Every structure is written in C-alpha cells, then in structure tokens.
XYZ file of N, CA and C in Angstrom:
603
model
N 97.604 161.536 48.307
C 97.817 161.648 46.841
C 97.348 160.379 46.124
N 96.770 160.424 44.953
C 96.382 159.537 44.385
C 96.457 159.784 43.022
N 97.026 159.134 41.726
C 97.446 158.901 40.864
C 95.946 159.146 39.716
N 96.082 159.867 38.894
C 95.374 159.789 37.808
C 94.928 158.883 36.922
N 93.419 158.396 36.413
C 93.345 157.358 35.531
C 94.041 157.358 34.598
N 94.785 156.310 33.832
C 95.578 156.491 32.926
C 94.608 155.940 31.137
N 95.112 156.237 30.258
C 95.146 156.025 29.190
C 93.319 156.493 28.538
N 92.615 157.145 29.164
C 91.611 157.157 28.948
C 90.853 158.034 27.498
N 90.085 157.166 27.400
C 89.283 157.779 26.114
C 87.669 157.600 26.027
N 87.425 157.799 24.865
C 86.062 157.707 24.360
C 86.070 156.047 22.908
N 85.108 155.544 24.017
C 85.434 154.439 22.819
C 83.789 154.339 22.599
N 83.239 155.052 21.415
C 82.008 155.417 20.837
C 81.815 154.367 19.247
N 80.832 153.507 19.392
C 80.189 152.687 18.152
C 79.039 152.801 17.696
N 78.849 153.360 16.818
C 77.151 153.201 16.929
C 76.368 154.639 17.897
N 76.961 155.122 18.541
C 76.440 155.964 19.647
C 76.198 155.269 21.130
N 76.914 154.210 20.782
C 76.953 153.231 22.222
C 78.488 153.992 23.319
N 78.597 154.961 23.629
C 79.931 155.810 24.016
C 80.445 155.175 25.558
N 81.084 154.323 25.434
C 81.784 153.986 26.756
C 83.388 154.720 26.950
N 83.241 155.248 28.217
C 84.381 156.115 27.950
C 85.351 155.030 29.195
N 86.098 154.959 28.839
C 87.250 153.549 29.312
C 88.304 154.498 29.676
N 89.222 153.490 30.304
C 90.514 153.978 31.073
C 91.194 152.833 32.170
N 92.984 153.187 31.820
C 93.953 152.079 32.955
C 93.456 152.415 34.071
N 93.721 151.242 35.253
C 94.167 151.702 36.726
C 95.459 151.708 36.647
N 95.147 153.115 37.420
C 97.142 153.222 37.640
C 97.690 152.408 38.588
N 98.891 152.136 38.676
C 99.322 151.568 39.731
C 99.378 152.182 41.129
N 98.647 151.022 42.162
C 98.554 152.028 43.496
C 98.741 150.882 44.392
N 99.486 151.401 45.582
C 99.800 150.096 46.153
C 98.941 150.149 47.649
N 97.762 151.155 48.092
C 97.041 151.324 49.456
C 95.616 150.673 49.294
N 94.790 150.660 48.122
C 94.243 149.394 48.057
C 93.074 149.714 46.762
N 92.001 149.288 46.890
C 90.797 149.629 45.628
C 90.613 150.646 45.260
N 91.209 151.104 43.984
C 90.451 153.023 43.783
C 88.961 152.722 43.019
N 88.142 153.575 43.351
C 86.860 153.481 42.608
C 87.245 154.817 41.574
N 86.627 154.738 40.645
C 86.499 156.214 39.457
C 85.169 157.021 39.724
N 85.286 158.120 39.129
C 84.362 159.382 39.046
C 83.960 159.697 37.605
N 83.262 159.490 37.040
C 83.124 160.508 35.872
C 82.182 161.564 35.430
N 82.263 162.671 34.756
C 81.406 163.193 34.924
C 81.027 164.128 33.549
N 79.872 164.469 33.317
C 80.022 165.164 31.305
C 79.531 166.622 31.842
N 79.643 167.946 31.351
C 79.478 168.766 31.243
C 78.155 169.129 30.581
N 77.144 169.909 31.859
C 75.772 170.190 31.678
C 75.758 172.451 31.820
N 75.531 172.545 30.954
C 75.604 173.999 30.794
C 76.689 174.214 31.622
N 77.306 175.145 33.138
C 78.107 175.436 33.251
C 79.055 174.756 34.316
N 77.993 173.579 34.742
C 78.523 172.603 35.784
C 78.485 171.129 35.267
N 79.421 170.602 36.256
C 79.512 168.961 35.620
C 78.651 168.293 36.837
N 77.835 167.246 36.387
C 77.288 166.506 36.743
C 77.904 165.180 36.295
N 77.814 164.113 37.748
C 78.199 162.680 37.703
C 77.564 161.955 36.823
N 78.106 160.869 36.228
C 77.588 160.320 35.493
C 77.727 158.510 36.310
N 78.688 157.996 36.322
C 79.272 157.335 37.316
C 79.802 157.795 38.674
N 79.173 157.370 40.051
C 79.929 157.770 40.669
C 80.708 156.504 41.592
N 82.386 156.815 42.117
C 82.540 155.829 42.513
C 82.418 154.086 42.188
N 82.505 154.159 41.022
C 82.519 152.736 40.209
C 83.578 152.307 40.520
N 83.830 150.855 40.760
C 85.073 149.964 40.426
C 85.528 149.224 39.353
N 84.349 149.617 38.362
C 84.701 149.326 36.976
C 85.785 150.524 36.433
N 86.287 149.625 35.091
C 86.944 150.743 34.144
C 86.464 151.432 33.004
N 85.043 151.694 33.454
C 84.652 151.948 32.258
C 83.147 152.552 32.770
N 82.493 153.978 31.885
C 81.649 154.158 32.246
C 80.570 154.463 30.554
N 79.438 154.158 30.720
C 78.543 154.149 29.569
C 78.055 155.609 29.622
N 78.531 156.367 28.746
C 77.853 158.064 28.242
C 76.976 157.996 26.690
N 76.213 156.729 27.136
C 75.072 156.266 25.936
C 74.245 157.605 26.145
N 73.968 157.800 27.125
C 72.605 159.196 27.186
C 73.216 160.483 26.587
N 74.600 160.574 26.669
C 74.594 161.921 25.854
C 73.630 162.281 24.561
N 73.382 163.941 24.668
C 72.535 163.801 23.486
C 73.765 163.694 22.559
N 72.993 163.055 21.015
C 73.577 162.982 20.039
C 74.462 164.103 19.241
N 73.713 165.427 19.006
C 74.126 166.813 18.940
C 74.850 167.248 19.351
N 75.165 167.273 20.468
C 75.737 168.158 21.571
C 77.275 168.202 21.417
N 78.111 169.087 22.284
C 79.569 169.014 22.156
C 80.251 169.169 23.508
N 80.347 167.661 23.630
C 80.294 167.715 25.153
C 81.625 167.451 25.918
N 81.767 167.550 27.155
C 83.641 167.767 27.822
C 82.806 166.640 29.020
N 83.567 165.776 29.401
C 83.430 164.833 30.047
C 85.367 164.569 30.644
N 84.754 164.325 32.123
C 86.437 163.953 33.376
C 85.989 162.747 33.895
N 87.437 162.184 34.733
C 86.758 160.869 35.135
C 88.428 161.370 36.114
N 88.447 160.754 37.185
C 89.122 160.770 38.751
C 89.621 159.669 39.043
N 90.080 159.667 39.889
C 90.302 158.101 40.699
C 90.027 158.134 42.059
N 89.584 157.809 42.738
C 89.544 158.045 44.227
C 89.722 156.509 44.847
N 90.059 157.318 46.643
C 90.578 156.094 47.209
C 90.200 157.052 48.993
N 90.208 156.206 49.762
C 89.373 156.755 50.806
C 88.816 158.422 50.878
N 89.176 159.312 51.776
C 88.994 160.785 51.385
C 89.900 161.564 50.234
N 90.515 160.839 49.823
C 91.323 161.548 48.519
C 90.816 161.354 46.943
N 91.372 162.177 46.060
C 91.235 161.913 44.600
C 92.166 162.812 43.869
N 92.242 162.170 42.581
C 93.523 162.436 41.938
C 92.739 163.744 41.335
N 93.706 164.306 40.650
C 93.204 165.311 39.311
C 92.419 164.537 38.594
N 91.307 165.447 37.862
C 90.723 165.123 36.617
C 91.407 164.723 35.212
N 90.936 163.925 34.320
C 91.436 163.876 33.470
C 90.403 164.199 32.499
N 90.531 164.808 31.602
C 89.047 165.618 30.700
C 89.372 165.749 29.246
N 88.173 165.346 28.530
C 88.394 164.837 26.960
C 87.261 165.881 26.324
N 86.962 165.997 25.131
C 86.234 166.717 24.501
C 85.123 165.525 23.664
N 84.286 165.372 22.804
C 83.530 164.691 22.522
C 82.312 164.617 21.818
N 82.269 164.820 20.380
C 81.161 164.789 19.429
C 80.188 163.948 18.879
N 78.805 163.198 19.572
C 78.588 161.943 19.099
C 78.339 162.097 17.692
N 77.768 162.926 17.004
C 77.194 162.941 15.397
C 78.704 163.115 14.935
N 79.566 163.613 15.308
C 80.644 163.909 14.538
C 82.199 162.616 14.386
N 81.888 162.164 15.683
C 83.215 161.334 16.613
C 82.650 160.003 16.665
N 81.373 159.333 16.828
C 81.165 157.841 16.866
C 81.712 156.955 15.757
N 81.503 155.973 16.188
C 82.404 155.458 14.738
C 81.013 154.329 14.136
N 80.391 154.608 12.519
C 79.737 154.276 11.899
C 79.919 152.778 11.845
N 79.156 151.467 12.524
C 79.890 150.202 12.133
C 79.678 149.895 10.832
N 79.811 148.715 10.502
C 78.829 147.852 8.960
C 77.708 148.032 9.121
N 76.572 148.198 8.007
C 75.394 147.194 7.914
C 75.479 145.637 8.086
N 74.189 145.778 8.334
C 74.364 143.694 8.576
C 73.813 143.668 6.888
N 73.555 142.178 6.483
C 73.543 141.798 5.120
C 73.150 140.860 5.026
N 71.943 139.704 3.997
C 71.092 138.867 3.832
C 71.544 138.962 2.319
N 72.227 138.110 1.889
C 72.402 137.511 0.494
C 71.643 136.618 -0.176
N 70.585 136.550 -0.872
C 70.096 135.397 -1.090
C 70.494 135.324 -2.948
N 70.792 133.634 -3.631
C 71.178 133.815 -5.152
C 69.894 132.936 -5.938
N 68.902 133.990 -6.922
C 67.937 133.890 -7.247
C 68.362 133.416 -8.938
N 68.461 132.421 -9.285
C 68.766 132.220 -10.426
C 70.185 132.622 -10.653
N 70.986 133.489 -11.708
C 71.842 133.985 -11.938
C 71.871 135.371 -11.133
N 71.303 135.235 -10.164
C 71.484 137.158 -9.478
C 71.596 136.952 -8.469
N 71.977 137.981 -7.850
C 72.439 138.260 -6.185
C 71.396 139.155 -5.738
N 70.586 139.053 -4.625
C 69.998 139.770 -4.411
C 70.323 139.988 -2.455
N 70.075 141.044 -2.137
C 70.557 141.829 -1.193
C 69.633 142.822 0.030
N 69.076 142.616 0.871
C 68.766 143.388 2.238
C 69.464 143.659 3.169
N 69.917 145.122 3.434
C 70.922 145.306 3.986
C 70.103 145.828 6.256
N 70.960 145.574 6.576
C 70.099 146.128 8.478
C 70.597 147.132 8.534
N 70.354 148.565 8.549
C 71.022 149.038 9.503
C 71.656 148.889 10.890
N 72.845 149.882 11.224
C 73.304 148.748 12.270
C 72.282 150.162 13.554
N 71.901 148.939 14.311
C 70.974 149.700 15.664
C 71.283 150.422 17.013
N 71.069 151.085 17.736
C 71.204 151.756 18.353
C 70.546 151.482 19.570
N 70.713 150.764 20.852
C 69.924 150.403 22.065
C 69.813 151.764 22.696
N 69.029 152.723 23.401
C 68.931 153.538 24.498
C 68.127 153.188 25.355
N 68.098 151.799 25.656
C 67.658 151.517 26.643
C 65.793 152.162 26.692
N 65.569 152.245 25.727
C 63.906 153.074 25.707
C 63.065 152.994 24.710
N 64.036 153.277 23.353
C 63.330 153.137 21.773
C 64.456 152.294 21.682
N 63.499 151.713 20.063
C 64.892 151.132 19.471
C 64.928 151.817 18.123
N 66.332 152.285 18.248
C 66.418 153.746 16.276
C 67.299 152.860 15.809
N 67.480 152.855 14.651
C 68.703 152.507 13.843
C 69.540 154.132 13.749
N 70.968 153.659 12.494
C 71.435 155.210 12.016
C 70.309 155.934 11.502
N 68.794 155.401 10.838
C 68.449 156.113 9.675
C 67.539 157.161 10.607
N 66.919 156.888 12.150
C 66.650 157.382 13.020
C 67.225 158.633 13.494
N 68.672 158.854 13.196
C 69.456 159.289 13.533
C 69.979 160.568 12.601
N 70.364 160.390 11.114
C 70.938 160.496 10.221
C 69.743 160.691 8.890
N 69.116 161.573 8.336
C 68.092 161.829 7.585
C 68.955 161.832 6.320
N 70.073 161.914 5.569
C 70.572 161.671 4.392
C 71.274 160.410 4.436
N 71.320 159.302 5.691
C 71.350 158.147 5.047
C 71.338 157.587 4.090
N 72.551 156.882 3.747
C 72.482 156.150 2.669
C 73.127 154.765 2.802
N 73.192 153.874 2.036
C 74.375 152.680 1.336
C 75.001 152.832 0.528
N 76.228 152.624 0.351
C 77.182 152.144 -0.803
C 77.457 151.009 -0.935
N 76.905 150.164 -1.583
C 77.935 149.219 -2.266
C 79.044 149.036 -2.587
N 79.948 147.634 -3.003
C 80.896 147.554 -3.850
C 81.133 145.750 -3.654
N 81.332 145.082 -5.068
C 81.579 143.839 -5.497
C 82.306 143.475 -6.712
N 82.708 142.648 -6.590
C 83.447 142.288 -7.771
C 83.341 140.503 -7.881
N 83.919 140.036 -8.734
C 84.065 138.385 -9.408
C 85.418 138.109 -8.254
N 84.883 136.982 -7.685
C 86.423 136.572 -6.872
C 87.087 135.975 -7.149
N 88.482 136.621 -7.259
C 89.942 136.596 -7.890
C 90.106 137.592 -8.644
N 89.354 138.588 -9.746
C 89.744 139.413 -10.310
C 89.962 140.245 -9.016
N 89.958 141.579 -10.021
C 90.477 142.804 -9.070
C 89.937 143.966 -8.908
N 88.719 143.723 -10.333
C 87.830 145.268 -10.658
C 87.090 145.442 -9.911
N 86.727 146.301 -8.680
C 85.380 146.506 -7.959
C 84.466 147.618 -8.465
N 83.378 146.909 -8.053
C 82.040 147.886 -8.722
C 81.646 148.688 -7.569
N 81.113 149.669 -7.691
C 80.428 150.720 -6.988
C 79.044 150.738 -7.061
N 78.362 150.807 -6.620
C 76.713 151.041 -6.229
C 76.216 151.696 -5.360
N 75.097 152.319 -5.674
C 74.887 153.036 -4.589
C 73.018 152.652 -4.336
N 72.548 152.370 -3.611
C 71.296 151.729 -3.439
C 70.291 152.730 -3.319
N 68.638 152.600 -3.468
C 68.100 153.931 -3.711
C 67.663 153.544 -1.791
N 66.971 151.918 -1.969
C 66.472 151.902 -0.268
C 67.653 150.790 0.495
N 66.993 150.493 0.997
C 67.864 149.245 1.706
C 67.393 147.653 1.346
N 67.816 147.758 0.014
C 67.732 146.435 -0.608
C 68.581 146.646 -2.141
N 69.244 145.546 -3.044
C 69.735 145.729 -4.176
C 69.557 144.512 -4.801
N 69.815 144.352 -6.295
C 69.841 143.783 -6.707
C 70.652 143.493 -7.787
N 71.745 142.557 -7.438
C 72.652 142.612 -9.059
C 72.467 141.808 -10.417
N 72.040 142.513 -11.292
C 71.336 141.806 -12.380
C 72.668 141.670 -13.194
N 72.255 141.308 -14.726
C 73.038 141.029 -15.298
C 74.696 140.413 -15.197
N 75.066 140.003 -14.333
C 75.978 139.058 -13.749
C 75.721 137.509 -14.481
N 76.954 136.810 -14.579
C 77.357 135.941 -15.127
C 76.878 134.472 -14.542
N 76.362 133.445 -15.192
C 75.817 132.227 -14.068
C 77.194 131.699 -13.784
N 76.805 130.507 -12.928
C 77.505 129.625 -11.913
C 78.798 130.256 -11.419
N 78.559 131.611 -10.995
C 80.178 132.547 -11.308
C 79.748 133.310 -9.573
N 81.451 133.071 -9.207
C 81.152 133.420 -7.434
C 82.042 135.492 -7.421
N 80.345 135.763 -6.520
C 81.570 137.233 -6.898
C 81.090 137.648 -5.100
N 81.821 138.489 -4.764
C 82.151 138.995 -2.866
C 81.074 140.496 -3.386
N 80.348 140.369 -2.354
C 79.917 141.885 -2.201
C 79.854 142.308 -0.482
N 79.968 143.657 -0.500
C 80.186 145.007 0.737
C 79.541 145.663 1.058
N 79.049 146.157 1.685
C 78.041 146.582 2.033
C 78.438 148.157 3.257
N 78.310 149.546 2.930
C 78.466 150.337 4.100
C 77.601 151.389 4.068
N 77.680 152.018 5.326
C 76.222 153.341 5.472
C 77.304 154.628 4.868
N 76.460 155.398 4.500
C 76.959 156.933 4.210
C 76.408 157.623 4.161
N 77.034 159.494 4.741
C 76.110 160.512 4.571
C 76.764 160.997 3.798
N 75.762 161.534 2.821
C 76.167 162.260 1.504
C 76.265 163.939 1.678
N 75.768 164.203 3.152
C 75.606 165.751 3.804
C 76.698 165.791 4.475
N 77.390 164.952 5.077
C 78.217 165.014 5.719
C 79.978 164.650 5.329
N 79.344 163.723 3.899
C 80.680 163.002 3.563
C 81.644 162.239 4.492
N 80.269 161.517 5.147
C 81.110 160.682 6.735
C 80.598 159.088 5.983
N 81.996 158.023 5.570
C 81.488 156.946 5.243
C 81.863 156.171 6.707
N 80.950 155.095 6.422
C 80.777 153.793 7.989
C 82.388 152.783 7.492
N 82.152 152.054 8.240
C 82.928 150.425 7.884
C 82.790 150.072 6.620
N 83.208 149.279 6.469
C 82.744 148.341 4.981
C 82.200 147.028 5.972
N 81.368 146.552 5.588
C 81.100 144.718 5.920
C 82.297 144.365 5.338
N 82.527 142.700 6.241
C 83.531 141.739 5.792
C 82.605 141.586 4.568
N 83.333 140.654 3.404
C 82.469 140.326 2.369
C 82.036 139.397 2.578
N 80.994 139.346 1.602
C 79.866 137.789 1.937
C 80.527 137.515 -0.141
N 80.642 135.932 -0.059
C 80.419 135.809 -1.614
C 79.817 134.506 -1.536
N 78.941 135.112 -2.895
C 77.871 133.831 -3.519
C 78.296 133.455 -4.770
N 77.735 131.955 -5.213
C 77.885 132.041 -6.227
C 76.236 131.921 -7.246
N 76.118 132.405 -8.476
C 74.958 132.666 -8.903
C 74.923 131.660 -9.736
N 73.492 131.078 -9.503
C 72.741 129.919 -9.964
C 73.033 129.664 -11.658
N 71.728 128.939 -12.166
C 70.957 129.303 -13.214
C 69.915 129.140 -13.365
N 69.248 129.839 -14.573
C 67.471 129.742 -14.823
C 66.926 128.601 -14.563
N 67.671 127.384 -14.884
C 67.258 125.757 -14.809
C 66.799 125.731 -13.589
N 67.803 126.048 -12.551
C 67.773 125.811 -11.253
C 66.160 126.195 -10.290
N 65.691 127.390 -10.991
C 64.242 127.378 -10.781
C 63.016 126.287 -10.538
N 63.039 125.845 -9.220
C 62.279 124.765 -8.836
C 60.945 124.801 -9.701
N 59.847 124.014 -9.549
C 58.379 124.003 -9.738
C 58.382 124.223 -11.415
C-alpha cells in the first residue's frame, strides 16, 4: 500500500502549467510520482517515475480540455490516482505586462511587453495566443484617490495633458474583450513629469 500524492493541483502562469503536489508521509523509503494527461481515450505519461514534486504540462495544447493523474509509487506498488480537470485558454492565470516609463517633458510616455510564453521551440507572447488582445490602463496623481481608465489602441500610450513637476503611479494589464478575462494589474511604476525647459539642446 502506498499513500496518495497529497494536495495536488495545477499551478498554470502564462501557459507555463506545472502541475505540483505534497509527499505524503511514508516511512519504507523514496516514492517517485507518475503523471499522466488524457489523449483521446487513453492516458499517456507525461512524467514517469520522477522524484520531483512537480511535473511541467507546458505541451498541453492550449485549446484543449484536458484530465490529467499523478500516483505515487514505491518499489512494485502505487497508490490510487489522483485526477484534476484543466483548461489552458480558460484556467491559466494572465500575469502583468512588463512596462518602460519614460517622462518626456510634462508627459508620461509608456511601452508596455507582453508577458511571454517559452515552449521550448517558438517564442509567442499572449498576443500569439489571444487575437482580441488588449491593454487596460489605469493612473492617477499620488496621494489622491481618482483613478483613470485607458484603454490603449497598440502597445504603447501616452499621457498628455497632465500637470508638470507632478508625480502620478500608472498600471498596466492584458485583456480580452471576447472573453471578458482581465490579467494582473502591474505593481505601479510612478514618475514624476518634467517641464518644457527641461528639453536639452
């Protein structure tokens, strides 16, 4: 007899899907794990026999709706399966954009990264991924309380008309407008904005 992995899940960022899990307590010696995702009507290994806690289900396709188990084993024995369900377009979790602030006179100006996606083959961002991609914005003056909303047409902005030598926080997150699935927010970045003088040459 051998004890079931405990606490296990899907811990999905980005479409980076490592599916994690406790060792249970066992007192006869090293259990290795099994895991395995569901391919039409049979499961195929994905990890086999690992002594890690953790196995990478980065290759799932993105689409798909997939059932994935993971075991414990220990010489000729193994525990029951333990088996999760699993949506990458639906279930990953959207991080921040990254963000490049630069203050051009009295303005804030803004290039946002999408956040990227390794498969080990290409390199996609979300927008690779996600064809109604978008950004939202949101900033305000730091210490007030009013935040602004924006919504960017590409992946760059610019806040005009803003106040000189005046420090305001801006945010930065991805969104689908098809899906009504928003990302993270970025921590805030705040600048403070110049003036015209300040224009070198």
């Amino acid at each position: 007899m051998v004890p079931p992995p405990e606490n296990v899940r899907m811990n999905s960022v980005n479409f980076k899907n490592i599916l994690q899990w406790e060792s249970p307590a066992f007192a006869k010696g090293q259990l290795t794990f099994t895991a395995q995702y569901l391919s039409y009507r049979i499961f195929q290994d994905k990890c086999m026999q690992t002594t890690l806690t953790e196995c990478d289900f980065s290759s799932l396709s993105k689409y798909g709706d997939h059932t994935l188990r993971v075991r414990a084993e220990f010489a000729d024995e193994h525990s029951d399966w333990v088996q999760i369900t699993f949506s990458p377009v639906d279930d990953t979790i959207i991080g921040p954009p990254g963000m490049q602030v630069e203050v051009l006179a009295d303005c804030l100006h803004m290039r946002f990264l999408a956040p990227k996606i390794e498969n080990e083959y290409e390199t996609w961002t979300m927008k690779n991924v996600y064809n109604s991609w978008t950004y939202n914005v949101q900033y305000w003056k730091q210490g007030t309380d009013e935040k602004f909303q924006i919504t960017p047409q590409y992946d760059f902005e610019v806040l005009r008309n803003l106040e000189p030598w005046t420090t305001y926080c801006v945010q930065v997150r991805g969104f689908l407008p098809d899906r009504n699935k928003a990302g993270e927010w970025s921590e805030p970045v705040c600048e403070q904005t110049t003036h015209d003088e300040t224009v070198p040459s």
